[PDB]
């Protein structure tokens, strides 16, 4: 989901509730945030399921890639954020 852009901040949210933190990987390639999620076959309420996604976000030009950080909430939302340099 969301791509919030403040004057002095940068923040993107992603609903990854089906993936455990160990099943997710975030990589910063230049000005691109890459999020990869993959989980092997798992039983759920409906049957059995495996999933995989690869999401790419464009970072604003005024954001130092080195300052990008991330976090996961209890509600399974992944947030990637960084300070704006201007």
Residue numbers in the entry: 66 to 151
Task: Show passages lifted from the paper.
Small Hsps (sHsps) form large oligomeric assemblies with a high capacity for holding onto nonnative proteins that are handed over to the ATP-driven chaperone machines for refolding. sHsps are ubiquitous among the kingdoms of life and within mammalian genomes occur in large families with members differentially expressed in many tissues including muscle, brain and the eye lens. Small Hsp sequences have in common an “α-crystallin domain” (ACD) of around 90 amino acids, with most having a short conserved C-terminal extension bearing an I-X-I motif and a longer variable N-terminal extension. The ACD is an immunoglobulin-like beta sandwich comprising strands β2–β9, and the assembly unit is a dimer. The conserved arginine in human sHsps is on the β6 + 7 strand at the dimer interface, not far from the dyad axis.
Here we have solved the X-ray structure of the ACD dimer of human αB R120G close to physiological pH, as well as higher-resolution αB ACD wild-type controls. Two mutations improved the diffraction resolution of crystals of human αB ACD: L137M substitution and truncation of the β2-strand. The sHsp wild-type ACD X-ray structures all have a deep groove that runs down the AP dimer interface. The groove is maintained through sequence changes, register shifts and across a wide pH range. The base of the groove is lined with four arginines, Arg120 and Arg116 on each of the β6 + 7 strands.
